[PDB]
Amino acid sequence: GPSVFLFPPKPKDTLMISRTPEVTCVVVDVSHEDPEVQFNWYVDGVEVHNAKTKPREEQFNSTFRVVSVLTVVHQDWLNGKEYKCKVSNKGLPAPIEKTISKTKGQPREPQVYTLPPSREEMTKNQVSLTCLVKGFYPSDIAVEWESNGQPENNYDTTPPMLDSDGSFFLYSDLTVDKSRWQQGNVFSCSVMHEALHNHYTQKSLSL
Amino acid sequence: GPSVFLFPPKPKDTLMISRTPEVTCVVVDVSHEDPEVQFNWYVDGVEVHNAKTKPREEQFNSTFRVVSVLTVVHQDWLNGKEYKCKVSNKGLPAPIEKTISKTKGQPREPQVYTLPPSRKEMTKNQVSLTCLVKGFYPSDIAVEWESNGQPENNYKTTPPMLKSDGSFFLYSKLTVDKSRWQQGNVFSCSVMHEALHNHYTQKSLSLS
Ligand SMILES: *[C@@H]1O[C@H](CO[C@@H]2O[C@@H](C)[C@@H](O)[C@@H](O)[C@@H]2O)[C@@H](O[C@@H]2O[C@H](CO)[C@@H](O[C@@H]3O[C@H](CO[C@H]4O[C@H](CO)[C@@H](O)[C@H](O)[C@@H]4O[C@@H]4O[C@H](CO)[C@@H](O)[C@H](O)[C@H]4NC(C)=O)[C@@H](O)[C@H](O[C@H]4O[C@H](CO)[C@@H](O)[C@H](O)[C@@H]4O[C@@H]4O[C@H](CO)[C@@H](O)[C@H](O)[C@H]4NC(C)=O)[C@@H]3O)[C@H](O)[C@H]2NC(C)=O)[C@H](O)[C@H]1NC(C)=O
Ligand SMILES: *[C@@H]1O[C@H](CO[C@@H]2O[C@@H](C)[C@@H](O)[C@@H](O)[C@@H]2O)[C@@H](O[C@@H]2O[C@H](CO)[C@@H](O[C@@H]3O[C@H](CO[C@H]4O[C@H](CO)[C@@H](O)[C@H](O)[C@@H]4O[C@@H]4O[C@H](CO)[C@@H](O)[C@H](O)[C@H]4NC(C)=O)[C@@H](O)[C@H](O[C@H]4O[C@H](CO)[C@@H](O)[C@H](O)[C@@H]4O[C@@H]4O[C@H](CO)[C@@H](O)[C@H](O)[C@H]4NC(C)=O)[C@@H]3O)[C@H](O)[C@H]2NC(C)=O)[C@H](O)[C@H]1NC(C)=O
Incomplete structure (x- = not known):
């Protein structure tokens, strides 16, 4: 039944x-x-x-x-x-x-790193902006990309994945017209997680 | 039943x-x-x-x-x-x-880019070397790391994820002693996928 x-x-x-x-x-x-x-x-x-x-x-x-x-x-x-x-x-x-x-276990704070596009991607029209979020626990988390205080259209976040040490990591991939990156616009990765101060942090990336 | x-x-x-x-x-x-x-x-x-x-x-x-x-x-x-x-x-x-x-559909070649650790991660004893594989289809793929032609086995690779445009992407993170990175060793990302020439490509990274 x-x-x-x-x-x-x-x-x-x-x-x-x-x-x-x-x-x-x-x-x-x-x-x-x-x-x-x-x-x-x-x-x-x-x-x-x-x-x-x-x-x-x-x-x-x-x-x-x-x-x-x-x-x-x-x-x-x-x-x-x-x-x-x-x-x-x-x-x-x-x-x-x-x-x-709620999932149990000692909570641990995400470390958030933004990585600019590879030089070898610069030959293309669109480039990839990368946010590495590692070291967190539990796996419940949310990751977004924004520019000029507005969310972005074309980004994807991988599901969290178990790391060596029993914590989780993930990556977020933001796809952006190379022109936008070259003008100097600032781009932002926003991470929400229970173990952050105010459940929120943000890291920015520009050229 | x-x-x-x-x-x-x-x-x-x-x-x-x-x-x-x-x-x-x-x-x-x-x-x-x-x-x-x-x-x-x-x-x-x-x-x-x-x-x-x-x-x-x-x-x-x-x-x-x-x-x-x-x-x-x-x-x-x-x-x-x-x-x-x-x-x-x-x-x-x-x-x-x-x-x-096998998954049907127009094969598409992986774009493979390697990315050095963040400026801000250098404050730590271990740094992450990132390998981004995007644009590929179908999802069957394999990723490895080597240095000086021997396996580096301290890496994790995400499952492929489906993008908007129908292609897949993934990331592979290799964790190394910051000393080894700063000492100028060369690390490489090897990808095997049916849409690569000879089913194999490889891309390296080193401290500038
Ligand atoms: C008739 O059809 C219905 C409807 O299915 C739909 O119609 C049919 C005709 C097909 O086309 C289907 O493909 C189609 O989807 C059938 O209903 C399905 O029934 C199965 C079980 O028979 C349910 O499986 C469970 O799924 C959950 C995950 O469910 C989320 O993800 C699904 C996609 O993967 C998605 O379809 C669901 O809607 C649901 O989505 C979530 O929804 C919530 C609320 O809306 C939302 O907040 C979330 O954001 C959203 N998430 C996503 C990703 O969309 C999964 O957790 C279950 O796994 C347990 O059980 C498995 C064995 O069945 C086992 O392999 C797993 O490991 C896991 O086992 C558990 O493990 C824990 C700890 O590990 C343990 O403590 C437990 O003991 C153990 N539990 C066990 C073993 O039971 C499970 O896989 C489908 O969700 C359900 N589909 C829908 C749409 O409701 C129905 O079965 C059909 N009837 C017959 C007779 O065939
Ligand atoms: C009685 O018990 C048995 C044994 O279960 C074990 O014991 C019980 C007591 C519980 O505690 C369990 O938690 C415990 O695991 C039960 O047998 C289970 O039956 C369910 C069905 O109800 C099966 O679910 C399917 O699972 C596959 C994924 O299966 C892999 O992953 C499991 C862990 O997640 C793993 O346990 C399995 O062994 C299997 O592992 C793989 O093994 C292969 C072979 O060696 C290996 O190569 C792989 O590497 C390995 N993978 C991994 C990850 O380890 C899942 O894909 C199925 O999903 C489909 O069906 C769902 C509905 O059930 C639906 O929600 C999904 O969305 C999906 O639906 C499909 O969607 C596609 C499009 O997306 C569509 O084209 C398809 O038509 C559509 N199909 C359907 C059917 O809708 C599904 O969840 C369990 O695998 C199976 N477990 C084992 C160990 O065999 C049994 O159900 C129990 N019976 C009762 C009455 O309680």
């Missing part, structure tokens, strides 16, 4: 005041015969009631997927509270329960 | 002739009643009898997992032959057929 997956909030959403983090409870394999799904949510054992239920999503294997979204308080999540989704459905012998909470 | 997952060879294995590439057919959710599985393998529709099967192994959810491994010839994979695994089990209405082949 149905199965349940419980997902943590987006890293950026738990670190920034402008964002509202969410805990997401997904029920798959809901059969067309028993479509009513019931959610009960608990923060550290105490039932809460601010959850919302998305439009049901039909799937191509002839099943529904039903999703309940629970907004959480930033500091609750960062302090280690446990979030419990309990799912009831007539297609289940017993209700299913899943619990999620 | 059983499900089947069919896995391609490891990228490095398809490119180096010192390595033996393999396709792996994994069957999970095999019940205690009906525990016997038969595998049939086809290369371009033609049945081969080459596969080697791993004894069934019980999981902690009471089901079995059974694995068939087929050795593949580097050139057949590179040329796009289709490998078909057919799984027969009594707990199944009809056998399950799964097929895999």
Whole structure:
């Protein structure tokens, strides 16, 4: 019958005041015969009631997927509270329960380095601006590129990857018209992470 | 009833002739009643009898997992032959057929650039030498580091990531004693990819 997956909030959403983090409870394999799904949510054992239920999503294997979204308080999540989704459905012998909470372990501060494009790339029309973020723990992090206080269009950040020492690193690749780089514009890598002062730092790069 | 997952060879294995590439057919959710599985393998529709099967192994959810491994010839994979695994089990209405082949699509040549450590990282006892490989397709690739013609093995390489324009990129980070960098040693990044001339390119870096 149905199965349940419980997902943590987006890293950026738990670190920034402008964002509202969410805990997401997904029920798959809901059969067309028993479509009513019931959610009960608990923060550290105490039932809460601010959850919302998305439009049901039909799937191509002839099943529904039903999703309940629970907004959480930033500091609750960062302090280690446990979030419990309990799912009831007539297609289940017993209700299913899943619990999620912040990843544990000694936090460690990202080191952020910006690297200009290789000289050998200078023959091309577009060049690559590189942000190396290493040494951090846990792996939840967010990395962006901006110029003149506005976010950039053409950049990609690799998923974090485990390093030798049990910390994580990643790279972010910003693709930029060589003209923009040559005029002298300043470009900025912004890193958001729970172990930074104010959850935020920024490093800049120009010619 | 059983499900089947069919896995391609490891990228490095398809490119180096010192390595033996393999396709792996994994069957999970095999019940205690009906525990016997038969595998049939086809290369371009033609049945081969080459596969080697791993004894069934019980999981902690009471089901079995059974694995068939087929050795593949580097050139057949590179040329796009289709490998078909057919799984027969009594707990199944009809056998399950799964097929895999090299990723189709216009190959594109990797651009390889090496990047020295940040100015600001030189304050540390170990520095990162970066190797950026971008613009390549398909995703199968291999990356290594050498100095003075011997392997440097203190590196991590990210999985390929998909870019906007359909090409892939990755980064490889080699960590060295700052002393070794400052002493002017030459380090090199070796990339192996089907769209490079002779499937190989190499790019070096040294302190200016
Ligand atoms: C019918 O179809 C539905 C829908 O699937 C869709 O339709 C079909 C027809 C196909 O086309 C599908 O390809 C298509 O996607 C099927 O539903 C799928 O069911 C599987 C399980 O059967 C679920 O797998 C789990 O996936 C999570 C990751 O889920 C994220 O990433 C998916 C892409 O990889 C994405 O599809 C999901 O939507 C989800 O995306 C996230 O969504 C949240 C909330 O919206 C969002 O905040 C995130 O940003 C977003 N992220 C991304 C990247 O998009 C994965 O975590 C699970 O892995 C566990 O279980 C595996 C075994 O199943 C095991 O291999 C893993 O290692 C891992 O194991 C766990 O390990 C932990 C610790 O390591 C351990 O504590 C646990 O014990 C262990 N748990 C185990 C073993 O269960 C898992 O892979 C799909 O998410 C789900 N798809 C969707 C869209 O919901 C359905 O199964 C089909 N029915 C039948 C009968 O076939
Ligand atoms: C009973 O238990 C077994 C054993 O599980 C183990 O024990 C239990 C108790 C749990 O604790 C588990 O956590 C624990 O692992 C269960 O068997 C599992 O079954 C699931 C399916 O439910 C399989 O999931 C698939 O996994 C592959 C990835 O598989 C690799 O990675 C796993 C770790 O992530 C690893 O465990 C696997 O062994 C396997 O490892 C690879 O092995 C090969 C061969 O040797 C090797 O060459 C590789 O190097 C190696 N790789 C790694 C990383 O180590 C994943 O790709 C599948 O994803 C597809 O399906 C999902 C839906 O299930 C969907 O969400 C995904 O998006 C993706 O969907 C596909 O999407 C593409 C397009 O993107 C589309 O073209 C496809 O059509 C579409 N396919 C589908 C089906 O939608 C999938 O997640 C586990 O691999 C398997 N584990 C093992 C060890 O065999 C069993 O499920 C349990 N049964 C019950 C009832 O509980």
